[PDB]
Amino acid sequence: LSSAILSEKPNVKWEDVAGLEGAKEALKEAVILPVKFPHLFKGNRKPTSGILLYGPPGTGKSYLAKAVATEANSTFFSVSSSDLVSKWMGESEKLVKQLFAMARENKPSIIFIDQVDALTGTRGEGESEASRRIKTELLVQMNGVGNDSQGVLVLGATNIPWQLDSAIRRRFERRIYIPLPDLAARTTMFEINVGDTPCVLTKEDYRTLGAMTEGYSGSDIAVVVKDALMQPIRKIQSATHFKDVSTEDDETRKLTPCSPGDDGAIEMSWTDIEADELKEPDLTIKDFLKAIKSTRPTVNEDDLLKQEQFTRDFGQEGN
């Protein structure tokens, strides 16, 4: 009956996100201000009810959701459109009803629905079975507790706003475009993703990277980072020739991979090698270079045109 939804804390702060600080402000006003100063909502001043996040896949929509949850200071519900599709062919939406009941009983709460362009795909003919009933279930259940006493905020997520119907479109409120990161945002993400490795230095390299990598997502950036972090491990694996670097003041001679031609090149493998005596290769520009060679652009520009078209049409507001 219940179907358990996790409300635990994905500890991702505001500062861990880059860009669209204006949407961030809208969110601060939508949750934080209500939390902080509820008595400001007497008379005709009333909380925002629904926000859709729309844009290409891989743009930290989920990441944003995590940050929201961390920052909400209240009950947070998260669900994928995968969940609660069908059981018997007859019974689906009762679970939706019960979910909303649960949320209403926990004020303040926030519901996050991922991939709202699934359920509600939408395509005709085949909709008339259970799916139209679902579509209806959304529309009616958003009408229920909406007036007067609200402690629910609805966050949707979508890749394809243009296939989301008129009926949802001007009932469900506030829509915000989540673009791919620009040079600045990319650079900042690079700087965020470092770890303990001393790596290659300055901001010059970072800005070089964020410039050179363009049309890529946060996810893609993450991938590149992981790649580069593994590249020294890859060096360690493939070269069995190693060599001493550090002085004898340490525990012992500290060994790093080198070419077979190198002076001091001992060729035993990783297997014999003690924990202390380890010298990982530094993280160089070349790791990022090879990563870029391996990095292919994801999304066709037609999708950009459709997102841009929706934006020209509906944009930074619900409608």
Ligand X SMILES: Nc1ncnc2c1ncn2[C@@H]1O[C@H](COP(=O)(O)OP(=O)(O)OP(=O)(O)O)[C@@H](O)[C@H]1O
Cite the annotated binding site by residue number.
55-62
When CB distances to ligand X are compared, the closest residue is: 218
Closer by beta carbon to a second copy, 184 or else 273: 273
Residues 56-95 close enough to bind a second copy by CB under 8 A: 56-58, 62, 80-91, 93
Helix (H, G, I), strand (E, B) or coil at 79: strand
* Residue 181 sits in the site that holds ligand X (CB under 6 A): yes
Nearest partner of 89 among 130, 136, 123, judged by Cα: 130
User: By CB under 6 A, is residue 108 in contact with ligand X?
Assistant: no
Known binding-site residues for ATP equal: 55-62
Name which of 211 and 268 has its Cβ closer to ligand X.
211
Contact 239, 258 (CB under 8 A): yes
List the interface residues with ligand X, window 136-155 (CB under 6 A).
143, 147
The least distance separating ligand X from the CB of residue 142, rounded to whole angstroms, comes to 9
Bridge partners, 80 (sequence order): 114
Binds 226: which of ligand X, a second copy, none (CB < 5-8 Å by kind): a second copy
Cβ proximity to a second copy, 58 vs 210, nearer residue: 58
With CA atoms as reference, report the closest residue to 150 among 182, 109, 120: 109
Kindly tell me which residue out of 23, 99, 258, 299 binds a second copy, with binding defined by CB under 8 A. Answer: 299
Cα-based angle 288, 290, 293 (whole degrees, multiple of 5) = 110
16's contact among ligand X, a second copy, none, with CB below 5 to 8 A by partner kind, is ligand X
Euclidean distance between CA atoms 219 and 229, whole angstroms = 15
Contact by Cβ (8 Å): 58, 220: yes
* Interacting residue with ligand X among 18, 110, 142, 224 (CB under 6 A): 18
Residues ≥6 apart with Cβ < 8 Å to 277: 251, 252, 253, 254, 255
**Residue window 249-288: x/- pattern of binding to a second copy, with contact defined by CB under 8 A:** ---------------------xx-x-x--x-x--------
Mark 63-82 with x for binding to ligand X (rule: CB under 6 A) and - for no binding.
x-------------------
- Considering the complex, state which of residue 57 and residue 315 has its C-beta at the smaller distance from ligand X: 57
Interface size with ligand X, residues (CB under 6 A): 24
**Cα(80)–Cα(157) distance, integer angstroms:** 10
Question: From the list 104, 234, 235, 254, which residue makes contact with a second copy (rule: CB under 8 A)?
Answer: 234
Contact region for a second copy (CB under 8 A) — 130-138, 182-190, 203-211, 243-251?
130-138
CB 7 within 8 A of CB 77: yes
Long-range contacts of 104-107 (CB under 8 A, 24+ apart): 104/145, 104/151, 104/152, 106/75, 106/151, 107/149, 107/150, 107/151, 107/152
Does the N-terminal peptide bond of residue 108 adopt cis geometry, omega within 30 degrees of 0? yes
Q: Which position among 73, 252, 309, 316 is part of the footprint of a second copy (CB under 8 A)? A: 316
Which residues touch 47 (CB under 8 Å, ≥6 apart)? Answer: 30, 34, 41, 150, 153
* Interface with ligand X in residues 186-245 (CB under 6 A): 189, 218-219, 222
Identify which of 144, 156, 152 has the alpha carbon closest to the alpha carbon of residue 48. Answer: 152
Q: Which residues bind ligand X (CB under 6 A)?
A: 16-18, 57-63, 114-115, 143, 147, 157, 159, 167, 170-171, 181, 189, 218-219, 222
